[PDB]
Design a protein around this nucleic acid. Structure first.
Ligand SMILES: [Zn+2]
Lengths: 172, 150, 44, 47, 146, 114, 243, 750
DNA sequence: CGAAGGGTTACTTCGCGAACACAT
DNA sequence: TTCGCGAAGTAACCCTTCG
């Protein structure tokens, strides 16, 4: 009845889809949702992402300025470590051929905080003036060391569309 | 090793939870005889039947009596086995009662008993706990080292 | 109250307003709420 | 973990179920006795 | 026996799709056992009366029950007429599995012969779930010795 | 009881991917998640990237997804999520860059048939 | 009635399972004879009396509003009024919950809940670091949920009560509770024929002589029901080796 | 079934799987040893075998066990290790090394009685009708009573009315337990009471130290949507908005300053994100990276049922249901002690190198160990004192145990089969409460309903039935790999608040998926078991009180077989019954065609089992084979037990294994310390159809007597039968008591 | 009238028993 | 691995008086 086409392409993408645990679904039973705001950060292979968003229109944060001890907040942060599954994909439709591109490391995120978290370890210097390796604590050791790649986006629409449509154009 | 004769004080079973010590030992010119000359091996008291509710022994006697007269060993398994309906047809074919109760005489006076006696073959076991090993007595023997007790 | 904060995902709480503003204010999740507020719940 | 507390003295040999007041003064073993299996006999007198 | 069986079957029919008038007790599913246990206990007494009304003269289990040699009149009607209602711990047999006593009965079945009602004799022979229901109650009195 | 209500729930939520398939006739940046293990050759093995297709609809509302080798690899209808914001990125560096792809809508299973 | 009951009478313990209290009535009519006497002993809470425990809010730190159905008091006869529930919050529960003095606004606005400046900054001499933050959570949210629990009416040692029927013409209630000194104080029952279990509280309210007569009766009740004849000259001595 | 199973297989197959797999698996994790001084001289334990000597066929252990019975000598074949050390020229040299002795129980794979029939049993002087299954050390023969326990990797929700309601979960780390509980105080406050941590820790910080800190999904992860759990759990979040609101920089610092193990080593490791052991020792789920969302959600499901068992009537798991009880076999019990003795052999081998290594002249000539003979005496004196004495107590795996190995009772033929096939008594000693002592309806196909030792140990110990199969172990990687194929959705991509979609699914006490289209998952995955693929253990059952569906895979529980019914008929198929007794298509060729599968206890509550064929309805899922299989070996001796009443059948099971009889064929060539014989044995006239299977008609234990039920002579008033003089005079029931009074004579020191 | 001393009741921890006697 | 009451041990709080 309907001979929907269907091809697999994608080699150098390695696309990382997220999962924000902050905003709910059908706010007021109206399909008009998902705004998000500017630039983020990143950390190397333990991944522990550093996506963050700034503030918005007024909420009267003047009484409890700002984070914990009057530090001038302008951003809300969140972190998430990217342990990988297998089996799923990413895919979209040309009123015909879905594309089914691969789905490299994917996990969710948790709302990590700014100097609210750092106030207790800052107070320690403000007022008070076997095998030690792999197995129990190396994940909490090699995860706070250096910075890397991170950069803003550019809303790549035509280039990735071309890269998904050209490679799969041999079977038909 | 020693040979132990069954004497007064040894206990027996019935495969149906019926313990019992030997009452006495008694001769063969005693316990009563039927028309063919069978005197019993063991006489049980019927008073152990109602309060113990063990009617499976009371099917076992009539299923084992027809098993001899037919020749074939018959079955007594759970939830089946040999039915009682086609059991006592062997009894009336041989010439016996439907219920396995033939009239006995008396060995002590000769005249026949006033009631009908339910007699037939039932498999009995012999246990441990013989009275030769349970017998124990002491008059004045050794004492304890610490408390000077027997 | 069982009321939670939007867009920063923690638990709302009501504190003293220091006689300058008459509202609630929260730890690690600032928010503004007016003087009108109800809680409809039936305990059988 | 040597034994069942590994030490008995003067109260453990006096605590009940093996002691003196329980197992040597009140209840004690007595000579001139004997036990054998019972059997029925109606021909005795009742005394 | 099918009269009280149909009565207990119809009383559950009024219990699932509707509701019954309660007694001065806790609630329903508690006054259900008092009405299904107080009804099946009359069947055994009635059949024990009409069994000894019928039972033949010059037989030894009636003479031992007339005297009291070793036995009673509920005893002689239990191996002849019918056994009935193996009570454990005061109430009926509870569920060993989820919402049912044995997997040989459908789920959430509070009918008799499922929660425990031996509708046979010792002469007649027992069914296997009926044999299990008798074997449970033969343990809780046997364990009272030890 | 469970099989009848099961097939009625499958009928009630079986049009939804056919609803989404004719939805979005234009092509902006969108995505949806497919999942399928057990890579088939489907005509032979040329090298992971295997040729595959045929995820059509049979008559009277029957999504007949199948891998083309032998199997009617049929089955859809995954769980609807409650979280809303979800976004696809790309951190293949290429002199330290990153992207922002398509605000993916949903997820649906592709189950083998036994 | 079996071996734990005689173990408990011999042991003379201080706690007891199912201590029923038998207290004979005056009248035998249908309404206002055996209903009100049960109607002031049954230990009702406010959960079956009051509708909702809504917290209406003014600008900072308002009260806890509670909406009490008088129609339930019209159905089941209870002698509580707009003042009787007001007294029972303050003085009947004073060392448990704390509320000094307020009044009702009018037309069922019982509001006996207050948190005055956080107990004046929690006893104003600053016991804590900005004491208890003056949050509406530590004492006010606690009192939000600790008051479907206060007693509006009843006798504070009683689990439940129900009415049994006399053999010939009347009916007779029986009470599962403790203490016995305020059950016979209730009008409608008389303290001349009020008997119960738990000998140690009969000794507490009647004496040593009226307690041994409860020993030689409860043993006579727990064993003659099993068909045991024990010739009560034996048990009158056992009631006098601990009297 | 009994032709290849044989009613004694729980001791045989467990020991065979031990010497096949676990004897190699122990040295797979205990083969690395070195020394600080001279960091050369490494040992590498390569492939081990139990009495083979691979360049031969059979040697040394040619002796029978009957020679090892009259001589007071143990029955054993020596075990061999190849070692690949380096001494002078660092070349790995091969040499066969005998290290231990290791007694082998009779009729095993490494035994001489394997494949013997009618000629070899008579030449080696042993009866071919005994069950075997026993050890023989120091002359006497001893069994290992199979112990049962509770389920390890589960959640027990046993409650209490006076004290607040309890919820616990034991575990195991390869030989230990490390149990945990928590009691609840102050009108609902969930704690985490553990013996390795000081007093009390609230639930709100454990989920923030391990997992989610959002405090929005937490009022849906453990609360559901709306029903009654909101006000119950809302008192537990007041503790987080008063003391501790954020992650590891306060969450793990609240635990690390309170937890203590401290080892007498590794002290200054405190506390911020390092020493995260206390959040990984609170289960058996070992994690390496920051991937513990399944473990955190498993802690959250551990505290969801304690909330569910407050509004609901009882909603408890009892310690009486035999779906909550596994059992440890003989091989699983000897494996832990062999592992502990091999590790005691390992570190005592380290101490014997540097003691004689301190430069006599050199270190490069001899065979580099030379001190194993006293250590070979030490490794066999522990196995010969764990079986003979019975104390398997070692201070490593946190258990003292006595009264597990008993001497084999040899009174009749069925007393040797009552010592065999006998599950023991675990804890909950039950002085006054008859909770774990009374009989339960759950033990239908297994755990025989009549065979119970009447006395002071009644109810605690019991006995198995005929059609009973107990597994050992099953793998876990190609089942979690297969659930992803069948359509589950792993936690790393369905982490949303859409997690309680009315059912869920978890694997053996570890939460993996969350399924939609639920009965499509259960029926399709059960069809994989009935077709020739992964099978033999896999319990598949959905729940209605709880909502998940279980794919239980860790072995050690009961697996009775039943026959499948179709939609409107059965899978009996009478041509298969004709082809069964023809010679081909045995019971092994009977599961592969999809006719029977092994059902369970916790699985058959999702099954409607028919008894006979004459009462089938299209709602059934299975059918039972033979309804007399509940009565076991000892209980099967009773003729017509369904006519007797239940105390009569229990009193015979303590008496069939007590009567004198015709014990064995080698009855006169054995010097037992006490055995009773009988001169003229007779078969029973009423053969039960299960005493023909266990061969009771070969060696019977009594005589047929022409009884006459009548009141006679007055000497039979109360339970005392009278006998004939002239029948005992002709030999009715003659006995022969046979006793041993052995002595030894030995040489002295001088 | 505010603060200090004496004293009543209330919350939490330990230990002592668990039946007779035979053969091991 | 268990219920029973009776010993200490320790805290919240109310009455009484002092200058
Ligand atoms: Zn927040």
């Amino acid at each position: 009845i309907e001979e929907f086409p269907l091809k697999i392409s994608g080699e150098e993408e390695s696309l990382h889809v997220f999962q924000y645990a902050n905003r709910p679904r059908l706010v007021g039973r109206k399909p008009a949702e998902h705004p998000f705001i500017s630039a983020a950060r990143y950390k190397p292979k333990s991944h522990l992402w550093e996506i963050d968003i700034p503030l918005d229109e007024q909420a009267f944060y003047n009484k409890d300025k700002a984070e914990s001890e009057w530090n001038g907040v302008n951003v809300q942060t969140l972190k998430g470590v990217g342990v990988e599954n297998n089996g799923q994909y990413a895919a979209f439709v040309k009123d015909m051929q879905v594309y089914l591109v691969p789905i490299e490391r994917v996990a969710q995120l948790k709302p990590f905080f700014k100097y609210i978290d750092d106030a207790n370890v800052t107070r320690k210097q403000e007022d008070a003036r076997q095998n030690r390796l792999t197995g129990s604590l190396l994940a909490h050791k090699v995860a706070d060391e250096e910075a890397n790649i991170e950069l803003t986006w550019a809303e790549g629409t035509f280039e990735q569309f071309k890269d998904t449509i050209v490679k799969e154009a041999e079977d038909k | 090793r020693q040979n132990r004769r069954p004497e007064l004080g040894d206990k027996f079973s019935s495969r149906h939870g019926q313990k019992g010590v030997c009452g006495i030992i008694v001769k063969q010119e005693d316990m009563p005889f039927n028309d063919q000359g069978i005197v019993p091996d063991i006489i049980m008291n019927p008073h152990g039947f109602p309060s113990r509710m063990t009617v499976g022994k009371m099917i076992e006697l009539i299923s084992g009596k027809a098993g001899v007269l037919n020749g074939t060993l018959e079955y007594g398994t759970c939830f089946g086995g040999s039915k009682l309906e086609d059991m006592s047809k062997i009894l009336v074919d041989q010439g016996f009662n439907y219920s396995g109760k033939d009239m006995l005489y008396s060995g002590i006076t000769g005249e026949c008993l006033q009631a009908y006696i339910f007699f037939g073959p039932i498999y009995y076991q012999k246990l441990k706990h013989m009275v030769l090993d349970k017998m124990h007595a002491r008059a004045r023997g050794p004492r304890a080292v610490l408390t000077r007790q027997p | 109250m069982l009321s939670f904060c939007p867009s920063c995902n923690n638990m709302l709480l009501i504190t003293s307003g220091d006689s300058g503003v008459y509202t609630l204010a929260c730890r690690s999740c600032p928010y503004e709420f007016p003087i009108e507020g109800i809680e409809i719940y039936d305990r059988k | 973990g040597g034994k069942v507390k590994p030490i008995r003295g003067f109260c453990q040999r006096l605590k009940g179920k093996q002691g003196r007041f329980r197992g040597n003064l009140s209840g004690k073993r007595v000579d001139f006795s004997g036990r054998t299996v019972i059997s029925p006999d109606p021909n005795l007198s009742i005394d | 026996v099918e009269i009280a069986y149909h009565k207990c079957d119809e009383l559950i029919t009024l219990f699932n799709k509707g509701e019954l008038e309660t007694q001065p007790g806790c609630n329903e599913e508690q006054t259900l056992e008092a009405k299904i246990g107080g009804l099946l206990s009359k069947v055994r007494e009635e059949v024990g009366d009409v069994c000894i009304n019928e039972l033949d003269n010059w037989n030894a289990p009636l003479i031992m029950a007339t005297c009291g040699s070793k036995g009673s009149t509920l005893n002689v009607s239990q191996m002849v007429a019918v056994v009935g209602q193996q009570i454990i711990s005061g109430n009926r047999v509870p569920d060993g599995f989820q919402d049912r006593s044995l997997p040989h009965f459908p789920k959430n079945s509070k009918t008799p012969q499922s929660k425990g009602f031996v509708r046979n004799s010792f002469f007649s022979g027992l069914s296997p779930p009926e044999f299990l229901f008798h074997a449970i109650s033969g343990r809780e009195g046997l364990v009272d010795t030890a | 009881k469970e099989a009848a209500a099961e097939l009625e729930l499958l009928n009630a939520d079986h049009q939804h991917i056919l609803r989404k398939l004719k939805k979005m006739n234009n092509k902006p940046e969108r995505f949806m998640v497919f999942q399928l293990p057990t890579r088939l050759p489907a005509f032979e093995r040329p090298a992971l990237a295997g040729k595959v297709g045929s995820i059509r609809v049979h008559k009277s509302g029957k999504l007949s997804v199948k891998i083309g080798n032998v199997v009617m690899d049929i089955g859809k209808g995954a769980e609807t999520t409650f979280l809303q914001d979800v976004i696809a990125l790309s951190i293949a560096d290429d002199a330290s860059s990153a992207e922002l792809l398509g605000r993916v809508d949903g997820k649906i299973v592709v189950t083998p048939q036994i | 009635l079996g071996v734990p009951r005689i173990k408990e009478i011999i042991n003379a313990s201080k706690v007891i399972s199912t201590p029923i209290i038998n207290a004979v009535l005056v009248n035998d009519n249908d309404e206002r004879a055996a209903r009100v006497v049960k109607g002031r002993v049954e230990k009702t809470l406010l959960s079956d009396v009051a509708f909702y425990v809504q917290d209406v809010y003014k600008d900072n730190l308002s009260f806890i509003q509670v909406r009490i159905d008088l129609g339930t008091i019209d159905k089941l006869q209870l002698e509580l009024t707009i003042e009787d529930i007001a007294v029972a919050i303050t003085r009947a529960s004073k060392l448990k919950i704390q509320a000094s003095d307020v009044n009702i606004i009018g037309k069922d606005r019982i509001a006996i809940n207050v948190f005055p400046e956080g107990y004046k900054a929690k006893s104003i001499s600053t016991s804590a670091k900005e004491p208890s933050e003056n949050d509406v959570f530590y004492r006010m949210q606690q009192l939000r949920r600790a008051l479907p629990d206060v007693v509006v009416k009843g006798l504070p040692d009683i689990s439940r009560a129900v009415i049994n029927i006399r053999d010939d013409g009347k009916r007779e209630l029986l009470v599962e509770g403790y203490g016995l000194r305020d059950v016979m104080c209730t009008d409608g029952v008389i303290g001349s024929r009020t008997t119960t279990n738990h000998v140690l509280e009969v000794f507490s309210v009647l004496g040593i002589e009226a307690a041994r007569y409860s020993i030689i009766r409860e043993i006579n009740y727990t064993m003659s029901n099993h068909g045991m004849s024990v010739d009560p000259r034996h048990i009158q001595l056992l009631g006098d080796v601990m009297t | 079934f009994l032709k290849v199973k044989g009613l004694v297989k729980q001791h045989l197959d467990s020991f065979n799987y031990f010497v096949d797999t676990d004897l190699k698996k122990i040295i797979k994790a205990n083969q690395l040893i070195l020394s600080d001084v001279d960091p050369e001289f490494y040992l590498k334990y390569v492939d081990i075998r139990v009495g083979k000597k691979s360049s031969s066929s059979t040697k040394d252990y040619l002796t029978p066990p009957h020679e090892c019975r009259l001589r007071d000598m143990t029955y054993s074949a020596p075990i061999y290790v190849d070692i690949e050390y380096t001494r002078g020229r660092n070349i790995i040299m091969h040499k066969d090394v005998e290290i231990g002795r290791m007694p082998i129980m009779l009729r095993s794979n490494k035994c001489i009685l394997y494949d013997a029939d009618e000629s070899k049993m008579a030449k080696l002087n042993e009866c071919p009708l005994d069950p075997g299954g026993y050890f023989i050390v120091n002359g006497t023969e001893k069994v290992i009573l199979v112990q049962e326990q509770l389920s390890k990797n589960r959640i027990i929700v046993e409650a209490d009315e006076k004290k607040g309601i309890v919820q616990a979960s034991v575990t195991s780390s390869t030989h230990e337990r490390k149990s945990k509980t928590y009691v609840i105080t102050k009108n609902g406050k969930i704690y985490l009471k553990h013996n390795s941590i000081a007093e009390e820790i609230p639930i709100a910080i454990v989920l923030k130290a391990c997992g989610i800190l959002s405090d929005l999904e937490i009022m849906q992860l453990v609360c559901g949507n709306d029903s009654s759990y909101q006000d119950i759990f809302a008192v537990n979040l007041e503790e987080s908005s008063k003391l501790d609101i954020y992650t590891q920089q306060q969450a793990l610092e609240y635990i690390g300053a309170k937890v203590k193990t401290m080892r007498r080593q590794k002290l200054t490791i405190l506390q911020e994100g390092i020493e995260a052991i206390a959040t990984t020792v609170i289960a058996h789920l070992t994690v390496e990276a920051l991937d513990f969302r399944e473990k955190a959600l498993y802690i959250a499901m551990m505290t969801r049922r304690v909330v569910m068992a407050m509004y609901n009537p009882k909603m408890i798991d009892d310690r009486d249901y035999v779906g909550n009880k596994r059992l440890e076999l003989a091989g699983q019990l000897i494996s832990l002690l062999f592992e502990d003795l091999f590790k005691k052999f390992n570190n005592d081998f380290k101490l014997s190198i540097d003691k004689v290594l301190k430069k006599p002249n050199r270190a490069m000539e001899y065979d580099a160990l030379l001190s194993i003979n006293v250590h070979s005496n030490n490794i066999t004196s522990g196995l010969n004192r764990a079986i003979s004495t019975g104390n398997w107590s070692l201070k490593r795996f946190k258990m003292e145990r006595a009264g597990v190995t008993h001497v084999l009772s040899r009174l009749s033929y069925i007393s040797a089969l009552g010592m065999m096939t006998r599950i023991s008594s675990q804890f909950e000693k039950s002085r006054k409460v008859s909770g774990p002592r009374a009989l339960q309806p759950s033990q239908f196909g297994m755990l025989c309903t009549a065979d119970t030792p009447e006395g002071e140990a009644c109810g605690l110990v019991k006995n198995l039935a005929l059609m009973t199969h107990i597994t050992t172990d099953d793998e876990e990687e190609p089942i979690k790999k297969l659930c992803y194929v069948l359509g589950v959705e792993d936690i790393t991509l369905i982490d949303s608040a859409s997690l309680h979609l009315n059912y869920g699914v978890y694997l053996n006490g570890t939460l993996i998926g969350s399924i939609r289209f639920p009965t499509k998952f259960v029926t399709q995955f059960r069809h994989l078991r009935r077709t020739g693929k992964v099978s033999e253990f896999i319990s598949i059952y959905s729940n209605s009180h709880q909502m998940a569906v279980h794919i239980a895979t860790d072995g050690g529980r009961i697996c009775r077989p039943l026959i499948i019914v179709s939609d409107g008929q059965s899978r009996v198929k009478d041509i298969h019954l004709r082809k069964l007794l023809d010679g081909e298509l045995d019971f092994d060729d009977f599961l592969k065609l999809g006719l029977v599968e092994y059902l369970d206890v916790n699985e058959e509550n999702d099954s409607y089992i028919a008894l006979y064929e004459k009462d089938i309805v299209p709602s059934m899922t299975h059918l039972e084979i033979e309804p007399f299989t509940i009565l076991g070996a000892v209980a099967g001796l009773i003729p017509y037990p369904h006519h007797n009443q239940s105390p009569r059948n229990t009193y015979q099971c303590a008496m069939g294994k007590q009567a004198i009889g015709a014990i064995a064929y080698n009855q006169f060539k054995r010097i037992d310390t006490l055995l009773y014989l009988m001169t003229y044995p007779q078969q029973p006239m009423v053969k039960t159809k299960t005493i023909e299977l266990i061969d009771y008609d070969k060696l019977p234990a009594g005589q047929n007597a022409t009884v006459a039920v009548m009141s006679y002579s007055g000497y039979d008033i109360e339970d005392a039968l009278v006998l004939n003089k002239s029948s005992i005079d002709r030999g009715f029931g003659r006995c022969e008591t046979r006793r041993k009074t052995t002595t030894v004579l030995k040489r002295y020191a001088n």
